Amino acid sequence: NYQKMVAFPILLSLSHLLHRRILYLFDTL
Amino acid sequence: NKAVDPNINWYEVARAMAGFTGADVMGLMARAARMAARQGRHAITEDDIYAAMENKTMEATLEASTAGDGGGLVGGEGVEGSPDPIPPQLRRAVSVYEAGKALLAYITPDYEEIARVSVCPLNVLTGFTLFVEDEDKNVNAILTRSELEGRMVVHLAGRCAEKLVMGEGQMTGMGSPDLFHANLIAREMIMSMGMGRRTGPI
Amino acid sequence: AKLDMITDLLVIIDSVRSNKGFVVFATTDIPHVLDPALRRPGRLDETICLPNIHTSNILNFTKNYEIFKSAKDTSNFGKKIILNEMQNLTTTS
Amino acid sequence: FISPMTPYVPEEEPTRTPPSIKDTGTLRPASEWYPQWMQYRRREDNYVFWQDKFMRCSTDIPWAEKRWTLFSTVWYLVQQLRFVGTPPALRYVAFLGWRALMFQVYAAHKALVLWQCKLDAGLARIGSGGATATFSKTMALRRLHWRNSPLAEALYALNLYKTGRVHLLPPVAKPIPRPTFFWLF
Amino acid sequence: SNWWASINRKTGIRGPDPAPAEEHTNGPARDIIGDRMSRRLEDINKAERQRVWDAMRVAAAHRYAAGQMPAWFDPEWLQQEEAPLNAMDRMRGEQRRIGGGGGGGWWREDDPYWPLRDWGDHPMRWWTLAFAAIMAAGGLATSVATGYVEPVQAGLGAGSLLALAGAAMSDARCVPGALGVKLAWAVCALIVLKEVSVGWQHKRKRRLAASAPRLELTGLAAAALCAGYMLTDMSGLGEVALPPNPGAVFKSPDVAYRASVWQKWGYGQVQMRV
Amino acid sequence: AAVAAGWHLASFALNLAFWGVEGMPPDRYWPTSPRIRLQIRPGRYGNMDGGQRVYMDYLARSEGVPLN
Amino acid sequence: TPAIKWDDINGIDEVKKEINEIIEYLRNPALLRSRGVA
Amino acid sequence: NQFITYQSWHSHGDLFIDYHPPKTFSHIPALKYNSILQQPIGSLVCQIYSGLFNKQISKNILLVNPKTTSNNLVDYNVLLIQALAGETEMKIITDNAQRYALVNRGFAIGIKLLREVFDAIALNTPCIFLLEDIHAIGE
Amino acid sequence: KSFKKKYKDKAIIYYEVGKFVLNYFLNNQLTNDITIFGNDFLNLKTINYLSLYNSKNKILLQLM
Amino acid sequence: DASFEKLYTYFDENPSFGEMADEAMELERGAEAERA
Amino acid sequence: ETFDRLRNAAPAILFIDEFDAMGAARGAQASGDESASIINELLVQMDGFEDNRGIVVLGATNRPGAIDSALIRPGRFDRIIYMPL
Amino acid sequence: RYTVPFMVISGLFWMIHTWILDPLPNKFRRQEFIRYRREM
Amino acid sequence: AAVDKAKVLEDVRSIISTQLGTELEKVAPEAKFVDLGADSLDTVEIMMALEEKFEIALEEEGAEKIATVQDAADMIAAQIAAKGN
Ligand SMILES: CCCCCCCCCCCCCCCCCC(=O)OC[C@H](CO[C@@H]1O[C@H](CO[C@H]2O[C@H](CO)[C@H](O)[C@H](O)[C@H]2O)[C@H](O)[C@H](O)[C@H]1O)OC(=O)CCCCCCCCCCCCCCCCC
């Protein structure tokens, strides 16, 4: 178990945080 | 251009819209789409257009009978002088009033014909009969004694019907504007048009 | 007082339909003195009457009550646990 | 002390939003925009179609649905990817596919309910001899509207199989409240 | 039949039908404001009276356990669950209108749908007690048969917690009932987690593919109990959640609550401008 | 190479299906202007009368009109 | 910036609390927010 | 605090666009008991959240709150429009039509000012104009 | 000195008691389950509704 | 036998105002301690 | 510049006297760019963006009804104290 | 390898796609008029 | 909620006829489904079709007592009135 179960929330969070970090990198530039 | 039902007799509707400009027509189709949304349809029907005309008339009266306190005329509000479930006695009285007006406008010859009859439009504690005039018959200038007396009978018809059905003591105050309108027609016939036998032309 | 501003206010209000993207709300407390031309279609025709709110029970208690209850949970189910700690023949639990 | 006949049933706050006024409750897809019964109601009394949208999504939110938890923190990402992270065109074609699939599964459930009515008649004959051979149409609609628990279904079937009594029905199942585990969900 | 021609304006005008109907009042105020708002006001008053009574008995409990109560106080009044006024109104309404668990059992003769009657306990009480019994028995038997001590330690140790949860779920209308169903779900979820993540030590084998933590009958039963709790009843103690964010109270109408969340979340001195 | 270019084309086609602004709610955390998002205002040092003329010319060029 | 005490003012009684609101806002905010004054 | 009161998009009158007011429909429990309000307000909110309000035809809506409030103790028309804009997280530009009640030397300066305002709000879309006291100039 | 206070206090409390007794009897001792204490101060809208509609008995209830 | 009007009058004389009012009173007590 | 100095020395009680010089509207004075610019700047400095933390502006006036509908709007000068006799 | 040319292509396409295709909500003409009348 | 019972009865008759096979004439208000020869399961299918057409939940308790077309239309119209609440 847990194989694509402990990954999908973490990858979801990483994608969301990455997109917001690109937007905030534009903001700080 | 927009979405309307194709089975609409636009002539009969335009006959009901006697005395309108063109932007008035445009806005009436817009509010007819609004009434279509209220009834739950995307297409506009002639029923929706007639409901738009009724909605315009009721809105016009409501923005003359609520300007500061109002009362009674706008039922269904959830506030002080406006019970939300219009009581069975009140809706029976409104139905009797409007049925009497419609019947006595039907049996009166050479009268304005009925397009629709509605009981409590806009949750308004009165009925509404949509009357369509014949502009080509008597332009916007001609009134005859037959038309005036028939109008007096039709305007007293609702309160006479509710007096006959609900009794003399259970008559409500919704017959007061029509009673004043019949009194106004009689007053203009006697004191203004010179149709009095004893008063004469003065 | 030169009241020629009405015939320009009519054009100003009629020019909104050519525009796109925004919505105009014109508020008034006296609609009877409003110009009937201003109430013609293509102009301020659609009306949303907002009846008075100074209603002693209805739109005062209900209004204030939902306003108060919408700001916080105000749920105290767990605090009822002390109602189950009343017959312990001890000093504390 | 002031015991009012019926034992006082505490009325807890709702934990789920009440179902929408356009819902069917029968696993069938709802209508696209207008729930089609408004045409059989009067105008200016159909005001409660937007008064369902208000107080289903703005003004009468249950506070159990405003709870902040770890599961809701994770689920916000799924909903955000669905709404602002996926194009509405692909959302629309997936919505059409889900509508067609739900119509097919509703037809399957309707056929299953009719077969369960036939089984109801069979079990009501085996248990009352040959006299009672009908079936409860109210129970048929109850199966169709998913108002029955599996325990209620089994108890009713057993009841038919060994005493008959078609029109003696199990109690309607209450709605399942939203589960809460502290800060987890 | 010619009921006209006798219509007199002086002696009263009457139709042939003898009066329309009667008039129903149900109170002057309810005549004034109508229904759907009399009903809303009545429901609001009932809910507020019940909230005030619950708060009053909680505070009275806290003061009576402190010994700060007057001599006329009866703690048995704290057993009155309903508000007294709502109890009186319900008395007025009802006076002007009119396999062997849980409870009894009849088995295909009378009262056939007896398991669905509200007996006062949680539906999963006998299920969690039976699971506690079989977990303790299986753990003891496995430890005796093999010699591993994880079956008995993760056996009776979880069975005692499940038995305590089943005891606490015998009255599933209280804070002990909510705490019992939460504890039982936590124990069963921990069993499922251990089984599908770590595995059972006595089930360790030679091959890596034979070790294979998997999901056997014990994990299936614990997951089924978890789903049973979720699908029967877990709501209760919903006030315990993560603390509210400043994003919750951005549109809140309470300046005091917004400032409290502001100060608790470290902002505090940011201008409110509301 | 076709697989890598197909992945890039799939991303571009997803952006094409996004297309414009429709289907997206307005966001109070992300207004459309970075000056709204941050706190950037002109103050006493830097602003001069001629700057209105220059601002007019830049705004005309940005809107796309050849007038000044 | 310019350069009789508060208790030397006696011509007002009730609005002294409304002025005291300004005193407490300048001396201690987040107490004023606990009184509903954002 | 995402509630900001920046100047116009043109900026350097001063249209004073209000971004994301801190109001919701929970501020008005008198909205859920009004049959008239539900259809236009819900239609506007759903058009805004769908994005279609961006590309929709502009419209004028008249609001009537009868004169019974003592002084200016929170006007419910501006309260409702601010709740609409705050729930939708949308720019709201407010103005009073009294300020355009100007006639000097036979010329109406307030008409030119109102025309400039109506042409300037055309550029900050999507937004909610709130012109209060339309009876002052529309007599 | 205090007898006038007693007379005034008794008049005020009996006015309030009788008003709320009449309110309870008319609004509750006549769905319709929770006790409601209806309030006075009929406005012009309420007066217009009760005058143009309802009946003599329903006007007499407000007068009581 | 009502015997709960005593409880209602007692809790009108000596009520409990909630955690938010407790926090506000704590802030007020700290202000008076730091001022007086 | 007044509000910038105030935001520097910022717990403060700026007192403006004769508010009808700037707090009024069009009327018997030449209401052109001048009064509009000063009232626009007063509005934006009182409103926000530049956080006026610890800044109270006490405006002295004799005709509050003469104060424009721009400095009364909730969030400008909503609080009003009448000094009795 | 393919990131940079595809990023340049998408950047140019979305630069075109907020100036010609999908501009302001059909209010460009009003904006240009404002620019005509405000250069006084 | 002022349901147009005439429209409801007309559409109910149309649904009954459409499912069974009869014309709109044969489906009369006072006519019993038994007269039309719809079996028990067929009556249930007709109630399902009525639910699908009107997009409402039929009142389960009382579906065993739907005998006339008028009774079916009356229960349906009562449900259409009670849906809006
Ligand atoms: C005429 C045009 C030609 C094509 C049209 C029809 C042919 C094919 C249709 C799509 C393919 C098959 C779909 C079958 C299952 C649906 C997939 C899914 O998971 O379900 C999708 C759900 C359903 O939509 C939403 O669903 C919501 C939630 O309901 C359901 O949501 C989920 C459904 O998955 C759960 O099951 C949940 O239990 C259930 O409640 C609402 O209820 C509404 O139905 C609706 O808003 O969406 C979501 O949440 C997820 C949103 C993004 C997922 C995208 C998946 C597929 C995208 C295809 C894009 C390719 C473009 C080329 C065109 C050719 C198409 C192949």
Cβ(L34)–Cβ(H120) below 8 Å: yes
DSSP characters over C13-76: HHTTTT-BS-EEEEEES-SSSS-GGGGSTTSS--EEE------SSIIIIIHHHHHHHTSS----
Tell me if chain H has a CB within 8 Å of the CB of C49: yes
CA distances (Å), origin C16, targets B22, C44, C74, H52, H56: 18, 11, 46, 17, 12
Distance of CA M5 to the CA centre of its chain: 12
Q: Which residues pair with C26 in a beta bridge?
A: H62, H131
Experimental method: cryo-EM
Burial class (CB in 10 A: 0-12, 13-18, 19+), E253: middle
CA distances (Å), origin H10, targets D124, F39, L35: 80, 17, 10
If one counts every other C-beta atom within 10 angstroms of the C-beta of residue E126, the result is 16
If one counts every other C-beta atom within 10 angstroms of the C-beta of residue D70, the result is 15
With an 8 Å Cβ cutoff, the interface of chain G facing chain K consists of 11-12, 15, 18-19, 22, 25-26
HSE at residue D91, side-chain half, CA atoms within 13 A, is 14
Cβ(M42)–Cβ(M21) below 8 Å: no
Tokens of residue K83, six digits:
């000094």
Report which ligand 1 atom has the smallest distance to the Cα of D95: 24
E90: Cβ contacts below 8 Å, ≥ 6 apart: D4, D5, D6, D8, E82, I33
Tell me if chain C has a CB within 8 Å of the CB of D13: yes
SS3 M79: helix
Are E253 and H26 a contacting pair at CB < 8 A? yes
Q: Closest residue (by CA) to atom 38 of ligand 1?
A: D98
**CA–CA gap between residue H104 and residue K27 (Å, rounded):** 10
Distance of CA E102 to the CA centre of its chain: 18
**CA–CA gap between residue B147 and residue L39 (Å, rounded):** 64
Are E256 and J24 a contacting pair at CB < 8 A? yes
**CA–CA gap between residue B31 and residue B21 (Å, rounded):** 16
M67: Cβ contacts below 8 Å, ≥ 6 apart: M32, M33, M34
DSSP H4: B
- Mutate which of E36, E92, E95, E97 to disrupt the I interface (most I C-beta within 10 Å)? E92
Separation in Å, CA of C2 to nearest CA in chain L: 27
Q: Pairing between strand H127-132 and C23-28? A: parallel
Q: Do chains D and H touch (3 or more CB pairs under 8 A)?
A: yes
Question: Helix H segments across K1-85?
Answer: 2-8, 33-47
Cβ(B96)–Cβ(B162) below 8 Å: yes
Angle H52-H57-H63 from CA coordinates, rounded to 5°: 100
**CA–CA gap between residue B45 and residue C49 (Å, rounded):** 26
Tell me if chain E has a CB within 8 Å of the CB of C89: no
* Resolution of the coordinates, Å: 3.2
- Nearest CA to L38 out of H13, F34, K26 is that of H13
The owner of tokens 């998408």 is: L10
**CA–CA gap between residue E61 and residue E56 (Å, rounded):** 8
Tell me if chain K has a CB within 8 Å of the CB of F35: no
Q: Do chains C and K touch (3 or more CB pairs under 8 A)?
A: no
Q: Which residues pair with B186 in a beta bridge?
A: none
Tokens of residue F52, six digits:
């209105």
Report which ligand 1 atom has the smallest distance to the Cα of D90: 59
SS3 B26: helix
Amino acid at B151: R
Are H12 and F29 a contacting pair at CB < 8 A? no
Q: Is the peptide bond before B6 cis (omega within 30 degrees of 0)?
A: no
Is the minimum distance from the CB of D86 to ligand 1 under 6 angstroms? yes
Tokens of residue C92, six digits:
């504390």
Amino acid at B6: P
DSSP characters over I29-45: -----S---------HH
Q: Shortest CB distance from C28 goes to which of H64, H80, H118?
A: H64
For helices E156-168 and E125-146, the axis angle rounded to 10 degrees is: 170
Is the minimum distance from the CB of D101 to ligand 1 under 6 angstroms? yes
Tell me the torsion sign for CA atoms F43, F45, F49, F54.
Answer: negative
- Nearest CA to J8 out of E59, H129, M78 is that of E59
**CA–CA gap between residue B171 and residue H119 (Å, rounded):** 55
- Is B98 known to be catalytic? yes
Tokens of residue B104, six digits:
């006595």
Residue D91 Cα to ligand 1 middle (Å): 6
If one counts every other C-beta atom within 10 angstroms of the C-beta of residue E73, the result is 17
**CA–CA gap between residue B59 and residue K45 (Å, rounded):** 44
Is the minimum distance from the CB of D31 to ligand 1 under 6 angstroms? no
Cβ(E225)–Cβ(E128) below 8 Å: yes
Q: Closest residue (by CA) to atom 52 of ligand 1?
A: D91
SS3 E71: coil
Q: What are phi and psi of E182, to 5 degrees?
A: -70, -40
SS3 K71: coil
DSSP characters over E187-248: HHHHHHHHHHHT--GGG--SSHHHH-----HHHHHHHHHHHHHHHH---S-TT-SSPPPTTT
**CA–CA gap between residue H4 and residue H16 (Å, rounded):** 10
Select from D77, D98, D102 the residue to mutate for testing ligand 1; criterion: most ligand atoms less than 8 Å from CB.
D98
Report which ligand 1 atom has the smallest distance to the Cα of D93: 5
Tell me the torsion sign for CA atoms E52, E53, E56, E58.
Answer: negative
Cβ(E168)–Cβ(E149) below 8 Å: no
Q: What are phi and psi of D52, to 5 degrees?
A: -90, -40
Give I46's contacts in chain E (Cβ within 8 Å): 32
**CA–CA gap between residue H49 and residue I62 (Å, rounded):** 48
Which position among M4, M11, M35, M39 bears the catalytic label?
Answer: M39
Are F36 and H19 a contacting pair at CB < 8 A? yes
The owner of tokens 């620019």 is: L35
If one counts every other C-beta atom within 10 angstroms of the C-beta of residue I49, the result is 26
The DSSP H or E segment spanning K58 is strand K58-59
Distance of CA I12 to the CA centre of its chain: 15
List all chains that touch chain F, counting a touch as 3 or more CB pairs closer than 8 Å: A, D, H, K, L
If one counts every other C-beta atom within 10 angstroms of the C-beta of residue J8, the result is 15
- Nearest CA to J6 out of H83, E69, F7, K38 is that of E69
Cβ(M29)–Cβ(M16) below 8 Å: no
Residue D101 Cα to ligand 1 middle (Å): 10
- Mutate which of F36, F48, F57 to disrupt the H interface (most H C-beta within 10 Å)? F36
Report which ligand 1 atom has the smallest distance to the Cα of D94: 10
Separation in Å, CA of F12 to nearest CA in chain H: 22
Cβ(F41)–Cβ(K49) below 8 Å: yes
Amino acid at J10: Y
Cβ(K75)–Cβ(H23) below 8 Å: no
If one counts every other C-beta atom within 10 angstroms of the C-beta of residue J33, the result is 8
**CA–CA gap between residue H137 and residue H102 (Å, rounded):** 9
**CA–CA gap between residue D25 and residue D132 (Å, rounded):** 30
- Nearest CA to E80 out of J3, C76, J13, I35 is that of J3
Taking 3-state DSSP, the helix, strand and coil percentages for chain I, each rounded to the nearest 5, stand at 65, 0, 35
**CB < 8 Å from D in window 35-94 of H:** 35-36, 38-39, 41-43, 45-46, 87
DSSP B188: I
Distance of CA H1 to the CA centre of its chain: 21
Amino acid at F26: P
CA distances (Å), origin B175, targets B86, B100, B162, E73, K55: 17, 12, 9, 63, 63
- Nearest CA to E151 out of E182, E185, E191 is that of E191
DSSP D14: P
Taking 3-state DSSP, the helix, strand and coil percentages for chain L, each rounded to the nearest 5, stand at 60, 0, 40
Cβ(E65)–Cβ(J26) below 8 Å: no
DSSP B121: G
| Nearest residue of D to residue B48, measured between CA atoms | D43
**CA–CA gap between residue J12 and residue J24 (Å, rounded):** 20
The DSSP H or E segment spanning E58 is helix E38-65
SS3 H89: coil
If one counts every other C-beta atom within 10 angstroms of the C-beta of residue B137, the result is 10
Give H68's contacts in chain B (Cβ within 8 Å): 68
Burial class (CB in 10 A: 0-12, 13-18, 19+), H114: buried
CA distances (Å), origin D152, targets D121, D164, E35: 17, 16, 37
